[PDB]
């Protein structure tokens, strides 16, 4: 678990970014999603409440570009609707 300061990615610069004009919708542009602490750009795919997902923690270096459609969060393999408190 690698605390991602805001500073992080100046010291682990993405090294093989892709540009924003190589993704191809339904696939969308994130500028930082890939990688340890999402140093990198991604063509990312949103995934719909209850459907399966792979754990993403920018964290810990995974990161998958199908990723659930924000609020909901990849919880137990599923992406779940969260509400806090």
Do not use: F, M, W
Request: include cysteine; proline fraction near 8%; charged fraction near 20%.
């Amino acid at each position: 678990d690698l605390i991602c300061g805001t500073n992080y990615c100046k010291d682990h610069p993405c090294t093989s970014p892709i540009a924003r004009a190589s993704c191809r919708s339904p696939a969308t542009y994130r500028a930082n999603h890939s990688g340890k602490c999402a140093c990198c750009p991604a063509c990312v795919t949103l995934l719909r409440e209850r459907a399966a997902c792979k754990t993403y923690s920018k964290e810990i270096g995974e990161t998958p570009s199908a990723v659930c459609q924000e609020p909901l969060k990849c919880l137990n393999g599923v992406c779940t609707k969260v509400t806090p408190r």
